[PDB]
Design a protein around this ligand. Structure first.
Ligand code: O2B
Length: 127
């Protein structure tokens, strides 16, 4: 079974805006998470074909990854900080849905989510 197209990362029809919260999500949240030792399985869309997971896109209907989130922030795709936070939440929930609790990949996602929530707790007020 083939891979689906990756999630949309740029749309010229969508309105664009610069806010302190979106800047914090790219410069602090995405940067700190990308550098983490457990980031590598979440840095790109799941390649179900290469990893031989034919049931991945049969179970996960709303895929998300940090590579997509990074591209979305770089292309001013998000209007609200909540849209970006929702994508990170979707990425973590997808990992917990597809894999069994206690599996190494789940433990990896749990450590990244713990760091993510701490950085979202330090999110600055809207300017
Ligand atoms: C996101 C996300 N949510 N669930 C998964 C998931 N589930 C499997 C562990 C069943 N795997 C990956 C996932 N993303 C990957 C990215 N690259 C590879 N590589 C294998 C080929 O050589 C080079 C390259 C580095 C393997 C990957 N895997 C699995 C195979 C894996 C294996 C060991 C440790 C952690 C993950 C993401 N996932």
């Amino acid at each position: 079974s083939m891979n689906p197209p990756p999630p949309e990362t740029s749309n010229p029809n969508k309105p664009k805006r610069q806010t302190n919260q979106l800047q914090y999500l790219l410069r602090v949240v995405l940067k700190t998470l990308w550098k983490h030792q457990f980031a590598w399985p979440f840095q790109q869309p799941v390649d179900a074909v290469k990893l031989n997971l034919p049931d991945y896109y049969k179970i996960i209907k709303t895929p998300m990854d940090m590579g997509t989130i990074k591209k979305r922030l770089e292309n001013n795709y998000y209007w609200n900080a909540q849209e970006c936070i929702q994508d990170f939440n979707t990425m973590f929930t997808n990992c917990y849905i597809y894999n069994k609790p206690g599996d190494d990949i789940v433990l990896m996602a749990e450590a990244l989510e713990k760091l993510f929530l701490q950085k979202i707790n330090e999110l600055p007020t809207e300017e």
